[PDB]
Amino acid sequence: VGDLMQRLQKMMPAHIKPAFKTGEELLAWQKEQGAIRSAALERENRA
């Protein structure tokens, strides 16, 4: 768990931090991003 998380962020630049700390926050964003984009797509092709 320790050493594997180290190499994870060696790929990225130094200034990046994780956008989500829990799975509930990820799915909150997932529904949010999905809801707005599904509406946007629906709007565009109808128009």
Partner: protein, 291 residues
């Protein structure tokens, strides 16, 4: 008998089968509201068959269910990837969960915004430790079973089982007769669902024959040609995207999960949004347009 009395009777027969019989999810949360209402979650000891033609996203849909099951539940989900390598699948799940264009991971530049989301995604997956993937190819039912049992004993039961299409499995003893082979695979997967008391999602291909029809939405009858899958299955879901069959359609980015059979409750179609870029399904926002 006037029009009012007879119409009273007609709406009743519709009213009865329209509403869902479950208050709240008894099974595992699918992560999709319209599907949760229709199924009440994926029930323990139910053989679930996710079947579709190629390019419908049957594999990514099934994978979304496992991805959602991993977040909304702490007990382990088991995935048998007979088609792809473990790491090839997991990279796809990172794109799916983090909603980053998959091409950008493979070739193009990854944005600082994109990098952040997958970092968070990975941290959460490392925290939970619910996802167990087995890339062993050409597995037998006995092998699938004993491996699922091993995970069940060494950890806190099993939450979900996932089989990357069923036809890749095999039974040496029956290998000569393909119809018998599939009959034993389907039976064993149902038996496995009961023993561990867990839903098992087993994918299945569909032969070309159906594409000679005008209406190319899969019907249950298209599984008897495959084998004895329809009999053993408790829940059957077909994926259909009009976009692939028709150049221009009323709906373009829309997919639809057609429940062909359900022991638990009602038959029907559930419409979802689909993204080819990051390979993930979303809920449809039909309820509220509001200009």
């Amino acid at each position: 008998k006037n029009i009012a009395d007879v119409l009273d009777a007609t709406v009743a027969r519709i009213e009865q089968l329209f509403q869902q019989p479950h208050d709240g999810v008894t099974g595992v949360n699918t992560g999709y509201d319209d599907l949760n209402k229709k199924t009440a979650g994926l029930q323990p000891s139910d053989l679930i068959i996710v079947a579709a033609r190629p390019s419908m996203g049957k594999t990514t849909f099934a994978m979304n269910l496992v991805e959602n099951a991993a977040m909304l539940q702490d007990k382990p989900v088991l995935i048998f990837s007979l088609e792809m390598p473990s790491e090839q699948i997991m990279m796809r799940s990172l794109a799916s969960l983090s909603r980053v264009d998959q091409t950008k991971i493979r070739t193009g530049q990854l944005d600082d915004e994109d990098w952040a989301r997958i970092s968070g995604t990975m941290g959460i997956l490392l925290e939970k430790r619910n996802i167990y993937i087995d890339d062993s190819s050409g597995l037998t039912p006995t092998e699938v079973r004993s491996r699922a049992r091993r995970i069940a004993r060494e950890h806190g039961g099993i939450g979900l089982i996932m089989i990357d299409y069923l036809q890749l499995m095999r039974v040496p003893a029956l290998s000569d007769n393909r119809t018998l082979e599939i009959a034993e695979i389907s039976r064993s997967l149902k038996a496995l669902a009961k023993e561990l008391n867990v839903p098992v999602v087993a994918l299945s291909q569909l032969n070309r024959s159906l594409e000679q029809r005008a209406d190319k939405r899969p019907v249950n009858s298209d599984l008897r040609e495959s084998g004895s899958i329809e009999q053993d299955a408790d829940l059957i879901m077909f994926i259909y995207r009009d976009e692939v069959y028709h150049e221009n359609s009323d709906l373009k980015g829309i997919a639809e999960i057609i429940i062909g059979k359900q022991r638990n409750g009602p038959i029907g179609t559930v419409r979802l949004t689909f993204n080819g870029q990051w390979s993930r399904f979303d809920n449809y926002a039909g309820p509220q347009y509001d200009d």
